[PDB]
């Protein structure tokens, strides 16, 4: 199966971001998520949208249950993404921690990019230089559409 959850642009508030203000992303960034089976930000975007729906449209039981996410885990995310990042962890390669992210932003118009998850290694956050090729080619691909 493949992820099918929709995104009811989508802005992330202060609650799901640690030490930050309300943040918003353009329609193109969220639209790019719907046809790509490798991104990491799309996963947490779906998890947070789903979570918000869970609080507002489902009352808290007296004894809360984990069965709800069990039956609907792969509808939100590609679990093989987690398995693949586990493989990069095992194989000494920089893996994705899913915690710290990075994203390019345009100065004049604020035309952002879909964030690509930071690649950690050795229990520490990498230098900017190691993925400088990645951010450079992402910038090239972003200026390509203009």
């Amino acid at each position: 199966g493949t992820f099918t959850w929709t995104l009811s642009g989508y802005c992330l508030t202060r609650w799901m971001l640690i030490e930050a203000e309300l943040k918003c992303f353009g329609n193109t960034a969220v639209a790019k998520c719907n046809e790509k089976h490798d991104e990491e930000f799309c996963d947490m975007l779906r998890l947070f949208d789903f979570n918000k729906q869970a609080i507002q449209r489902l009352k808290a039981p007296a004894q809360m249950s984990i069965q709800l996410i069990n039956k609907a885990v792969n509808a939100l995310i590609n679990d093989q993404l987690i398995m693949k990042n586990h493989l990069r962890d095992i194989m000494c390669i920089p893996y994705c921690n899913y915690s710290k992210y990075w994203y390019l932003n345009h100065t004049t118009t604020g035309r952002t990019s879909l964030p690509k998850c930071w690649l950690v290694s050795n229990g520490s956050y990498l230098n900017e230089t190691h993925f400088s090729d990645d951010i450079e080619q992402q910038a090239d691909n972003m200026i390509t559409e203009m």
Partner: protein, 182 residues
């Protein structure tokens, strides 16, 4: 720092604590221990040590299910953990206790072809965040799993639900048949 000369980079961090209500979260605290929060009310607690809290080889699964004093989510997570072992083929290594709704599970560990390999390999998946993959050998002898209430249990790492949603696919894909009919 304008990387393309007109694009500036900006970092971002996701506060996973908002997922407390629905999904179960995981922290590491110390290297030895690894903690799981099932909401803010109850949470499992995984430890490695040289002591032993269970001194008997019996576990009494069926009696615990019959009494049904336990909490459903915690037993579900223990089920996902135990079934997710690659090659569990030693029932003697397992032991546990379910007195009065408690959860208290324990695994014994001990060239490399033992259950220590399997339990450690699933343990690394359970709580997440450069030798070979096979036969990771922890110095500690016994693994314990218990239930605990909620306090500050996040020192090495922030909460992360990656592991629990990860091994759900692995929950039954590596098991040895124990009887001609399963």
């Amino acid at each position: 720092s304008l990387y393309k000369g007109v694009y500036e980079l900006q970092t971002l961090e996701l506060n996973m604590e908002t997922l407390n209500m629905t999904m179960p979260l995981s922290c590491t605290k110390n290297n030895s221990h690894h903690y799981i929060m099932v909401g803010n009310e109850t949470g499992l607690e995984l430890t490695l040590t040289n002591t032993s809290i269970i001194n008997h080889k019996f576990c009494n699964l069926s009696d615990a299910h019959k009494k049904n004093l336990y909490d459903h989510a915690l037993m579900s997570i223990i089920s996902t953990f135990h079934l997710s072992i690659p090659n569990f083929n030693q029932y003697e290594a397992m032991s546990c206790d379910f007195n009065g709704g408690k959860i208290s599970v324990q695994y014994n560990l001990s060239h490399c072809g033992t259950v220590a390999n399997g339990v450690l390999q699933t343990f690394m998946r359970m709580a997440w965040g450069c030798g070979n993959w096979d036969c990771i050998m922890t110095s500690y002898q016994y693994l314990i799993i218990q239930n605990t209430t909620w306090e500050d249990h996040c020192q090495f790492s922030r909460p992360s639900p990656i592991g629990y949603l990860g091994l759900l696919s692995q929950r039954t894909r590596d098991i040895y048949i124990s009887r001609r009919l399963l």
